[PDB]
Design a binder for this molecule. Structure first.
Ligand SMILES: [Mg+2]
Lengths: 180, 5
């Protein structure tokens, strides 16, 4: 069936927003860095590798607000062994109602696509924030574009996007503003 | 890779 169960009573009237992880909220690497926000041990074939994670500027204020405005869902093409621990350390306000990983993506033409149709939500009430356009090729008119982040600590994308989401949380049909 | 390809 669908990837998500019915929305909880409190989230019924809210628009569902799919939020990507890598290069959107954080940026990670296996290359050691001293200013990492999180260090996550990831076991691969018996070997324990360390992943260094950097948080994107204003990510905390961003997730706290989005959590109040929408039914937030983490959707990533990364493996849970990596993404689940990052989400645990990152989401202190319980913004994420659900989390979907690589297995939930549809591999189509070489790319993992976040097929929003599999969510089980009225697409007129769904938005996706992903740094890679290829992630939503199946639903280009539900997408709220955002630039890929890596380490620019002067970034203000997440902060600057809030007013926009603020007004979208009020519309009845996202297509009315995103054109479709 | 465990991260997003
Ligand atoms: Mg990404």
């Amino acid at each position: 069936q669908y990837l998500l169960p019915e929305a909880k009573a409190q989230d019924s009237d809210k628009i569902c927003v799919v939020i990507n992880l890598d290069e959107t909220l954080v940026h990670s690497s296996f290359k050691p860095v001293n200013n990492a926000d999180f260090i996550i041990p990831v076991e691969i074939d018996g070997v324990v590798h360390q992943v260094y994670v950097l948080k994107r500027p204003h990510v905390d204020e961003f997730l706290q607000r989005m959590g109040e405005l929408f039914e937030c869902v983490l959707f990533t093409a990364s493996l849970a062994k990596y993404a689940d621990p990052v989400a645990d350390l990152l989401d202190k306000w319980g913004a994420f109602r659900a989390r979907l990983f690589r297995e939930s993506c549809v591999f189509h033409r070489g790319n993992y696509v976040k097929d929003l149709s599999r969510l089980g939500r009225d697409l007129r009430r769904v938005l996706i924030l992903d740094n890679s356009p290829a992630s939503y090729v199946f639903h280009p008119d539900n997408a709220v574009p955002v630039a890929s982040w890596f380490d620019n600590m002067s970034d203000t994308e997440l902060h600057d996007l809030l007013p926009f989401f603020e007004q979208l949380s009020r519309v009845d049909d996202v297509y009315s503003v995103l054109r479709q | 890779s465990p991260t997003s390809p």
